[PDB]
Write a protein that holds these residues in place. Structure first.
Motif, mmCIF file in Angstrom:
data_model
loop_
_atom_site.group_PDB
_atom_site.id
_atom_site.type_symbol
_atom_site.label_atom_id
_atom_site.label_comp_id
_atom_site.label_asym_id
_atom_site.label_seq_id
_atom_site.Cartn_x
_atom_site.Cartn_y
_atom_site.Cartn_z
ATOM 1 N N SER A 49 -28.419 -68.523 29.095
ATOM 2 C CA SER A 49 -27.785 -69.818 28.876
ATOM 3 C C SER A 49 -26.586 -69.998 29.801
ATOM 4 O O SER A 49 -26.238 -69.102 30.570
ATOM 5 N N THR A 50 -25.956 -71.167 29.721
ATOM 6 C CA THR A 50 -24.795 -71.467 30.551
ATOM 7 C C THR A 50 -23.704 -70.421 30.370
ATOM 8 O O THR A 50 -23.261 -70.160 29.251
ATOM 9 N N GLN A 51 -23.273 -69.824 31.476
ATOM 10 C CA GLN A 51 -22.230 -68.805 31.438
ATOM 11 C C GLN A 51 -21.280 -68.952 32.621
ATOM 12 O O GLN A 51 -21.686 -69.367 33.708
ATOM 13 N N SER A 52 -20.014 -68.611 32.403
ATOM 14 C CA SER A 52 -19.005 -68.710 33.451
ATOM 15 C C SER A 52 -19.099 -67.526 34.410
ATOM 16 O O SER A 52 -19.184 -66.375 33.984
ATOM 17 N N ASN A 74 -28.868 -76.014 37.788
ATOM 18 C CA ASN A 74 -28.234 -76.959 36.876
ATOM 19 C C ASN A 74 -28.288 -78.377 37.436
ATOM 20 O O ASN A 74 -28.449 -78.573 38.642
ATOM 21 N N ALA A 103 -14.475 -70.098 39.240
ATOM 22 C CA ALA A 103 -15.102 -70.065 37.925
ATOM 23 C C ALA A 103 -16.017 -71.269 37.724
ATOM 24 O O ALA A 103 -15.559 -72.410 37.673
ATOM 25 N N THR A 104 -17.316 -71.006 37.607
ATOM 26 C CA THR A 104 -18.295 -72.069 37.412
ATOM 27 C C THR A 104 -19.328 -71.676 36.362
ATOM 28 O O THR A 104 -19.716 -70.513 36.263
ATOM 29 N N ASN A 105 -19.774 -72.656 35.581
ATOM 30 C CA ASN A 105 -20.764 -72.414 34.539
ATOM 31 C C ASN A 105 -22.178 -72.500 35.102
ATOM 32 O O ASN A 105 -22.514 -73.440 35.822
ATOM 33 N N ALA A 106 -23.004 -71.513 34.767
ATOM 34 C CA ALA A 106 -24.384 -71.480 35.236
ATOM 35 C C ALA A 106 -25.253 -70.622 34.323
ATOM 36 O O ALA A 106 -24.777 -69.664 33.715
ATOM 37 N N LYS A 107 -26.532 -70.974 34.230
ATOM 38 C CA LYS A 107 -27.468 -70.236 33.391
ATOM 39 C C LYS A 107 -28.222 -69.191 34.207
ATOM 40 O O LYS A 107 -28.157 -67.996 33.914
ATOM 41 N N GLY A 131 -22.865 -63.879 33.376
ATOM 42 C CA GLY A 131 -21.581 -64.508 33.126
ATOM 43 C C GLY A 131 -21.171 -64.428 31.668
ATOM 44 O O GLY A 131 -20.341 -63.599 31.296
#
Length: 131
Positions: A49-52, A74, A103-107, A131
């Protein structure tokens, strides 16, 4: 015991698709081997799932490439598909390369190499993604 936490996919491979799940360890304990040819080469790994993320380091092995690219998936937040690269230049060096970013959110993470490497399609024995 042949399947990552979520799922992985590559561009080249020796067998008929199965070595990709050998990255379950994501360390030297794994032995990824892409089928020679069929360039450019690429490969992405699905965490869950979405993680930093801050900085990810991966190895290219004997496969010496003139340049590589690291990105994720994404677009709609829940329905990832495309994305913008995070790195790209003349920083080959078959040796392990650590790519650090903001720092970026990504799965899931995906890596592409506009240019091939060597006799071997692609390699990845030391690739950290999470992440």
């Amino acid at each position: 015991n042949l399947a990552l936490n979520k799922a992985t996919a590559t561009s080249s491979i020796e067998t008929a698709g199965h070595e990709g799940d050998k990255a379950v360890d994501g360390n030297a304990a794994t032995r990824w081997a892409s089928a020679y040819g069929a360039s450019p080469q690429w490969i992405y790994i699905n965490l869950g799932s979405t993680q930093s993320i801050s900085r990810v380091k991966l190895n290219w092995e004997d496969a010496y490439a003139t340049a590589y690219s690291i990105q994720v998936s994404n677009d709609s937040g829940s329905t990832p598909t495309n994305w913008t690269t995070v790195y790209s230049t003349t920083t080959g060096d078959g040796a392990i390369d650590d790519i650090t970013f903001a720092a970026t959110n990504a799965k899931f993470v995906r890596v592409y190499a506009t240019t091939r490497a060597t006799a071997y399609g692609y390699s990845l024995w030391e690739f950290e993604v999470y992440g």
